[PDB]
Amino acid sequence: NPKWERTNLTYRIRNYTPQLSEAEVERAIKDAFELWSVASPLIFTRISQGEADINIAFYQRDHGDNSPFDGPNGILAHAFQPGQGIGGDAHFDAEETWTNTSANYNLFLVAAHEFGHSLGLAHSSDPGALMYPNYAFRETSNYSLPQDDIDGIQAIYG
Ligand SMILES: O=C1N=C(O)NC(=O)[C@@]1(c1ccccc1)N1CCC(CCO)CC1
Numbered sequence: 001n002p003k004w005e006r007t008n009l010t011y012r013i014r015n016y017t018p019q020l021s022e023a024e025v026e027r028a029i030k031d032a033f034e035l036w037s038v039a040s041p042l043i044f045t046r047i048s049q050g051e052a053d054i055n056i057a058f059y060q061r062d063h064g065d066n067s068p069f070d071g072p073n074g075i076l077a078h079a080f081q082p083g084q085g086i087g088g089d090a091h092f093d094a095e096e097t098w099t100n101t102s103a104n105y106n107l108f109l110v111a112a113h114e115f116g117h118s119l120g121l122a123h124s125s126d127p128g129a130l131m132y133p134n135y136a137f138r139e140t141s142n143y144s145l146p147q148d149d150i151d152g153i154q155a156i157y158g
């Protein structure tokens with residue numbers, strides 16, 4: 001069970017996607033981290049300089065980590081289990097259409113799912129859980145962590 005030994009973690013947005021404004025990308029990420037924060041003792045702090053626990057970036061095909069992206073559709077992003085260096089980091093496929101609406105693909109939703117991986121959660125078998133191994137849009141306004149996911153982080157961090 002790889003998990004963070006610390007509760008205050010830092011994250012850093014290394015690059016942005018041209019598809020949305022910087023503020024939009026930052027808002028999506030912030031909201032995505034908040035989902036998890038309200039159900040655990042984890043506190044996330046955004047940094048702009050230096051080394052952060054969770055590095056977030058948009059990359060194309062080969063990007064230096066044994067898991068190149070596949071272009072439009074297919075895998076949308078990937079994250080690393082809690083750990084030093086690359087651990088906890090999340091990479092988003094730069095070739096995907098990134099949105100903040102119902103159109104594929106909503107960044108807030110994909111990001112929330114990736115952060116679950118970054119936190120140590122595995123995939124869930126419950127089709128209504130954020131951690132279910134498939135992307136499906138759900139109303140983002142006032143969206144909150146589903147029941148199963150709350151049980152998930154809870155089981156790890158309390
Ligand atoms: O389950 C996933 N888990 C990821 O970490 N990354 C993905 O892209 C993932 C994902 C799921 C949900 C949200 C974000 C990402 N997913 C997207 C849909 C795809 C379906 C191929 O038909 C299977 C891999």
Ligand SMILES: [Ca+2]
Nearest residue numbers: 071072073075
């Ligand atoms: Ca892809």
Ligand SMILES: [Ca+2]
Nearest residue numbers: 053085086087
């Ligand atoms: Ca890291």
Ligand SMILES: [Zn+2]
Nearest residue numbers: 063065067091
């Ligand atoms: Zn990667």
Ligand SMILES: [Zn+2]
Nearest residue numbers: 113117123133
């Ligand atoms: Zn996943």
